[PDB]
Design a protein around this ligand. Structure first.
Ligand SMILES: Nc1ncnc2c1ncn2[C@@H]1O[C@H](COP(=O)(O)OP(=O)(O)O)[C@@H](O)[C@H]1O
Length: 356
């Protein structure tokens, strides 16, 4: 049983994703994504061992026949997914990077002497790291997993395979209070001007928290407007909106299509409707009522109604989100909203392991 991610952090949090080159994991079809994890000797969970990109069906090399059933087994690339930690926790960030680099050296030895065999639950030579295997029905093989023997590969990581995920208190988005917030607010889809715009529309209104209301408005409006922009750009079917009704040819499979996700650059990972919870029933009604016209002044009635309704009923920006993450006091937890850096920017490069 792989431990679930911790959901609570006192302040801003960081998670890292790292797709490996030089090997594959082969497993039965419809297998769980997680097959193991690496923890410290003290028991702290550092990262998960996951299958990532499907590379086709697995064919056991004839010279490695072992009387075992490998029927319908699929081959996938490996991705190392960290357990989130506090962004300012240097020790936690460093242990994750070192633990990933150690596992790469272990994999390099494994494809050399135990090619086409499962990873065994072992402790590192220095005692720092422990592998726990949660799905024994797997094998690790060099390159593409077609040949019985490797090409003497050194298992590496690379920025092309790297992502970072940052969690921040929802109430902080638009305040620019910290360098994380300012980095997130630099997302091209985020329109800061919408804050002062909300203020102008709501002068006669007695708002419970007008500055929080303006922050939520700018955040949600920015997401809604970008979704519409992307739906028009890529010809995405949103709710009942048909891109072909507006002579737009579909050129993506949906919101979760890698190219649509890449177009966000800083991808929201939390369900937009969750942010309404940080406001009073009254302030939320005020924020929500002002969103429709921002869509309707830039997009058709159909695209505007459909994007608005989609996010109202709990629609996700790009598939299942991270919606149970929290910040602040453990006893009175506040909503955390998460963002995926599709490409790791220079400001976040220090959180990522670098093959020596
Ligand atoms: N509270 C959090 N703060 C920051 N990052 C988080 C948090 N919870 C999860 N993440 C991160 O989310 C990233 C990947 O999310 P994941 O659900 O596994 O991706 P996907 O489902 O799209 O394959 C990891 O880097 C992980 O650490």
């Amino acid at each position: 049983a792989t431990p679930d991610f911790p959901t609570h952090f006192p302040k801003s949090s960081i998670g890292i994703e790292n797709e490996l080159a030089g090997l594959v994991v082969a497993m039965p079809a419809n297998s769980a994504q997680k097959f193991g994890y690496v923890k410290s000797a003290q028991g702290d969970a550092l990262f998960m061992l996951t299958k990532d990109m499907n590379q086709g069906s697995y064919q056991r090399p004839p010279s490695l026949q072992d009387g075992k059933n490998y029927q319908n087994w699929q081959t996938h690339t490996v991705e190392l997914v960290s357990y989130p930690c506090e962004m300012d926790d240097k020790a936690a960030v460093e242990t994750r990077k070192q633990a990933m680099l150690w596992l790469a050296t272990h994999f390099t030895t494994h494809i050399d002497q135990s090619n086409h065999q499962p990873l065994a639950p072992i402790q590192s030579e220095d005692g720092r790291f422990v592998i726990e295997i949660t799905n024994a029905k797997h094998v690790i093989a060099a390159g593409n997993g077609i040949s019985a023997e490797s090409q003497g590969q050194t298992i590496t990581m690379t920025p092309s395979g790297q992502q970072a995920t940052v969690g921040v208190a929802a109430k902080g988005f638009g305040t620019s209070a910290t360098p994380e917030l300012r980095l997130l607010e630099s997302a091209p889809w985020y329109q800061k001007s919408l804050k002062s715009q909300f203020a102008s529309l709501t002068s006669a209104e007695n708002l419970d928290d007008k500055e929080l209301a303006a922050n939520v408005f700018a955040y949600l409006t920015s997401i809604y407007l970008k979704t519409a922009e992307l739906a028009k750009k890529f010809g995405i079917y949103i709710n009942e909106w048909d891109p072909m009704s507006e002579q737009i040819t579909p050129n993506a499979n949906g919101l979760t299509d890698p190219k649509v996700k890449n177009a966000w650059e800083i991808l929201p990972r939390t369900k937009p409707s969750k942010i309404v919870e940080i406001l009073s029933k009254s302030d939320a009604k005020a924020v929500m009522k002002h969103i429709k016209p921002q869509l309707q002044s830039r997009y058709s009635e159909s695209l505007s109604k459909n994007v608005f309704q989609y996010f109202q009923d709990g629609g996700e920006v790009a598939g299942h989100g991270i919606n149970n993450a929290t910040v602040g006091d453990k006893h009175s937890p506040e909503l955390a909203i998460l963002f995926e850096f599709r490409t790791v920017p220079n400001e976040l490069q220090s959180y990522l392991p670098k093959t020596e």
